[PDB]
Design a binder for this molecule. Sequence first.
Ligand code: CL
Ligand code: CL
Ligand code: CL
Ligand code: CL
Ligand code: CL
Ligand code: CL
Ligand code: NI
Ligand code: NI
Ligand code: NI
Ligand code: NI
Ligand code: NI
Ligand code: NI
Lengths: 231, 231, 231, 231, 231, 231
Amino acid sequence: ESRLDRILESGVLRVATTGDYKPFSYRTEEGGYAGFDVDMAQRLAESLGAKLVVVPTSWPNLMRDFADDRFDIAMSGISINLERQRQAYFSIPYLRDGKTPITLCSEEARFQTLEQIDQPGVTAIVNPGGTNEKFARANLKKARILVHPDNVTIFQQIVDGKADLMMTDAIEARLQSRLHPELCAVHPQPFDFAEKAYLLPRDEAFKRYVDQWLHIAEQSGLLRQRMEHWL
Amino acid sequence: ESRLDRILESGVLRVATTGDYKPFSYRTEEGGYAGFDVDMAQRLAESLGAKLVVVPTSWPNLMRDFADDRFDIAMSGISINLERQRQAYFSIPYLRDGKTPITLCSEEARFQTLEQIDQPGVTAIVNPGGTNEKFARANLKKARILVHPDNVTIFQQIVDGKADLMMTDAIEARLQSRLHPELCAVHPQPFDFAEKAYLLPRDEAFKRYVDQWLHIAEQSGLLRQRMEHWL
Amino acid sequence: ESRLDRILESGVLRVATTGDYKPFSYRTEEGGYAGFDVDMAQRLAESLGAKLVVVPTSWPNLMRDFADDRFDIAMSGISINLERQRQAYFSIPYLRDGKTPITLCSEEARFQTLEQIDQPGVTAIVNPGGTNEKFARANLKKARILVHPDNVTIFQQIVDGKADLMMTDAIEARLQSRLHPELCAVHPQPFDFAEKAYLLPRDEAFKRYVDQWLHIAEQSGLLRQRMEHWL
Amino acid sequence: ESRLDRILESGVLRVATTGDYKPFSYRTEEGGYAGFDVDMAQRLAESLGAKLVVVPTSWPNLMRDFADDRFDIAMSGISINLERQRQAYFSIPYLRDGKTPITLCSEEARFQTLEQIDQPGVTAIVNPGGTNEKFARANLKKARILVHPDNVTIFQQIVDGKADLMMTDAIEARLQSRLHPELCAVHPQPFDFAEKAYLLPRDEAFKRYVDQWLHIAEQSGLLRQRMEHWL
Amino acid sequence: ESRLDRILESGVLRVATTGDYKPFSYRTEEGGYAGFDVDMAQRLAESLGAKLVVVPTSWPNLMRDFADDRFDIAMSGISINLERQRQAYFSIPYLRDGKTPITLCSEEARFQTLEQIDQPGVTAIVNPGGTNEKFARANLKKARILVHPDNVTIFQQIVDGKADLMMTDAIEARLQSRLHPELCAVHPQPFDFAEKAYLLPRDEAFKRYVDQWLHIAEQSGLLRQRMEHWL
Amino acid sequence: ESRLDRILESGVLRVATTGDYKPFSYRTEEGGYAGFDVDMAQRLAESLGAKLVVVPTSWPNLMRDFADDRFDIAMSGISINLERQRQAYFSIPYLRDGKTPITLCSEEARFQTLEQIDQPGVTAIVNPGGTNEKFARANLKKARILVHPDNVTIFQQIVDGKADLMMTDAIEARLQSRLHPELCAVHPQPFDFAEKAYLLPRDEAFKRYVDQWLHIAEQSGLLRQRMEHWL
Ligand SMILES: [Cl-]
Ligand SMILES: [Cl-]
Ligand SMILES: [Cl-]
Ligand SMILES: [Cl-]
Ligand SMILES: [Cl-]
Ligand SMILES: [Cl-]
Ligand code: NI
Ligand code: NI
Ligand code: NI
Ligand code: NI
Ligand code: NI
Ligand code: NI
């Protein structure tokens, strides 16, 4: 009936992950994968008596890969949103997040609200083809949106004065502000709300299983332990 | 597979509503529909890229209209109950409510408990064919139950002395006690428990979508904003 | 479509229960069944206009009986675990529990953690073929595990010095420590986490109904009332 | 030692109240006092075996009357603030409130934040000599502040176009928006935070008593009962 | 300045206790004292580098002994009430309780509310000179109140048919219903609210210390540990 | 009467701080003070219309300086403990913390509990004369305690193999594990409980004021804002 049965029979759990989003999912020096969600993936696979098989995907290709049935579950710092919910399921959430500006610490007071940010003289930098760009284009009608394809240098462009800010996952803003003390994550009284969860096929029994596993992890304190370790 | 796909393809969301229950659902002077649940309906339709098409229904006809597939979702100050759950699904809840007496303020102390209310000398007035009548007949074995078909004058009958009280949705009792300072909503330490939710077909993917949409509204604070506006 | 419809048509709800686990499920002097979960079962059956038909099962046979479709729901102090979730569904939970040591009160400080317990000189007694034995074998690599088939005398073996402790449901440890003031339930800052819930077939509509019924019981305070009565 | 002893000996509790703030404190047709805080005052006096003696005061005179020892406690919809805390004590709080704009419903979107409100072309109306005026002058450096002494007509000035909005207690904004459907209370995701509490002398034992009384009212559900009745 | 300093200098903490209220305070076979509050007392004394000296008191004499300064703190299953708050302080609370009927299990449905209980044909038994008698006389204007001085046999009188019920601390009702399976503690949706706390002199610094000690016990989980052990 | 009045009259608030505990209190390149608690200190002083005057103190001298009345309040990442509560007051708490091991990440599993840590072959390093040393000596009867006076190099000694771990404030362990990815903060399901608060004189009115100020900061979200900025 269900993918749950298929996974139990094959002894393989195919987990898609991007490897481009520390602390959730990133590449080891040896070319392997590591991170909070890789850790969780190992635990889910083990609960199913299954080998963990990591399937590479990317943000632009995530939903195409989903439709093509390239994986059983995607675990990679993925936000729940209604566009994705059109085609897929999500597990129960494991983290509260949301987009938020990262900007020069010296300019923090200037960029608290969309109204302050959405001005002709402002430049918001974004990476191409993902939810960051969608969020910028949906919420900025006046500010310049600068699309920057090289994610290795994107935050550096803010420091270098090519852009005023980027609006990205709060967890990313926070981490980058550590990598670049020059930068600060804006933190109003919240800027946007979202949750992280695991992307699932439209499969009732498999979702019930994944949710039960994640719920036990959450209530037992295991989830918090791993979050304290990684995040 | 799912009604979710059908709605996404047709670009129409059919929402049933009664238009007889301010603040959830009522008629504008022009003959249109307005209210908290009409507002929410517009937001759900928009999230689906769909036109909102309001389908009239009524309390006596609600479940018949459901069975006849006259709508995709019903949004109209509808309480979750197990009788309806026999045939339909409900979304996650958006409001805690429950039946409660509305009575003369001067008589408030007399009507705190079913035991006090369920006495030969008491008259409880009710509207025909809905959950109010069912609740009265299930909980009053001694008191007189007076069925009154004209909802425009029903609360006036309490003030006029034709009945001692009515047991109805707390939100309605509260509102009517504003319309008629003569009346008070009874508020024990609670009288009955119920939640309001949206009536759904037995459709897993569509329910998951609606719940995700409503959950985001709830956690982001949007739901509270609209409740503060309307309720 | 659903077992929900079948139950509504037949007017019978088949509930499996073990009758070997006071306060959830036990036998009356007359050979009937009683307990918290029998009480709840009566309420669920009544909500469905159905006769309650109790179907005997046992811990070793529970999942076999499930696979054989011997019952509609099992209600018997059953813990949610992922092994069972492989084949079945669970309702939303009604009690937080988890395994915990029961030991001589005089030895309580010695048996707070698995590390203290899992030592060559320690003997943990367990009943055969259930989750207690599985838990012991999964968590004790050094201590002796003593399998004792006679559940009537099993706790007596601790008092009699044949074993140091047993690790069992906290609710059971607590109750037995009342039956035997000689014994104490260990209570660290928690030892293991689990929830009790009702075992369901993979049936979406029936699960939605059961969950709605149980949710109303929980939020209305009925669940707490019955727990205060029995537990 | 304490005013507590003095009140217990004299059998009189002097409670100051303004009588100008329904639902907390207002005047009856006969010239008496009524309201939520008068109700609570009666209960506190009764707990002390004391007569309730209401002592009139006003917002401009409140702290002067306090310094002059004209009362034992003031109960009148009073917000805790640090200016008052310089000289007085407060009981534990009984209501969460805070200032918020009340404006034309048609203009609600324009007045969500101080930044939007504090513009040259905007006029904020306020009553003289209280916390409303202090709040306006502390938070508006550009907008016009219009001082209006006649509290009976002050909200009417907004409707009449003499002012764009007033920033006042949320409970007042809410109530006035009921009196004038023309007006709406602004409700962002919160605009300002404050609590209502009772004004006390610097008297440890008397504060401990009042807090114990109020805590019992809160935890027993009595407080909520009276709030549901009045507010 | 404070009793805190005096206790620190003398190295003695005088704790009053009744020894007539298991599980809080009772007598050992050897004539010593034991119980949850004796345990807590030892911990408070130790934190102060002080010897624990237990001072006997009784319910009728508690406040007289307080006034006579016979002890530093009383720890004995004592409820906070406003009568005691007239003269003494209380620590922050450590347990939520309240009076509740204990009655024959077969009669449980008959005695849910004061209204049902307060009838001419009903007899409520009470022990003399304490809060139980005060509660009965304050809340029963019709029922017979039977004063029974022998606390060893008082619950037996209910079983023996000399009385219908007693209204006493919920923790006591619960325990007695264990001692006498014949009896049940009534548990409405709550009957009365009260908290247990420690009785303190009007001494600010000593109260701040005791509260800090108890707060740490509560937040660290120590309090729950001891409650799980004793209660 | 109170120091509150004295501060209001003098227009000076003397705040003691150590300047040796980033992120709470540290020295700027210019020799000034900075940090979360310096930020909060500025806000408290401003609320009192007072100049902030920072008074240097140190961990060994803190309580001596308190007794000598060298300051009005101490704000410096100070934990509430009962030893300090003997002489001083604390404000309400602003942060939950507690001691926890920091150790090599590779050795994390070995040092989860005091029992594992307190072994002959283990060396715990500590700084002299503070709560870290007191905690080590109170909880380690077998492990070696190595006292290391140079706080600049103390964590380096763990990395260098001179010690296995240090037990220190969780916030410090966390920060140092960032400074030294080589190290990890242990995070069991909690190791020890403590709160941070501000050290106050035994002065009722001043404590009530400080608590009111801090409570407003907490409930308004200001406290969280500053914590998100600094911590
Ligand atoms: Cl770690
Ligand atoms: Cl509005
Ligand atoms: Cl019972
Ligand atoms: Cl009312
Ligand atoms: Cl125990
Ligand atoms: Cl920041
Ligand atoms: Ni770790
Ligand atoms: Ni609005
Ligand atoms: Ni019962
Ligand atoms: Ni009322
Ligand atoms: Ni114990
Ligand atoms: Ni910041």
